[PDB]
Amino acid sequence: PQITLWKRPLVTIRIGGQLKEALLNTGADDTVLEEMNLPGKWKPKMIGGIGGFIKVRQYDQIPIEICGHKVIGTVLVGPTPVNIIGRNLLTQIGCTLNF
Amino acid sequence: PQITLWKRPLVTIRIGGQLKEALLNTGADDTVLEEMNLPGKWKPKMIGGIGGFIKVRQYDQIPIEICGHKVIGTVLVGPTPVNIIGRNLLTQIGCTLNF
């Protein structure tokens, strides 16, 4: 699809077969999800943003579907105010910026 | 152009006569540049993201050329970790996400 940028580019994602709204974010290296009790092994990570750093849990090889497109990779979980799909998954779904 | 996302989408911009490198950021509502001088009146604002809130100077109706495309709009200046082009200017240069 084509997504204009008049509004926040929010799309539906599926992680654990369960559905969330997430922001397609070219300014994010990684994918960060709002706090959720995801099962699996994780490692601690600190990620940086506009205001400083936050601590998150890093889960690897997690299947995720983005607007119907299957992906699998690293997902970070922590106290982000919005679910964020970052470049690690945007590349897997063949997402580009065009102008 | 069409820009893939395996690397950070950094482009050259010209603003107030000066060349800088900036990140095309669909996850930002606003454009925020690293500390610099700009001509004209500004107003104090705060903006937020991951890691919290920072204080910025808001300059209105500022011309900026982004990867060869002209925009004129709001530019925030403050302690951002990187120069960010947000949706307010991405829309002006006709940028969409596509997959």
Binding site: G27 | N25, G27, A28, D29, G49
Partner: peptide, 10 residues
């Protein structure tokens, strides 16, 4: 209301 979701991983 946060609005600028720059994110970087070290």
């Amino acid at each position: 209301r946060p609005g600028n979701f720059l994110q970087s991983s070290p």
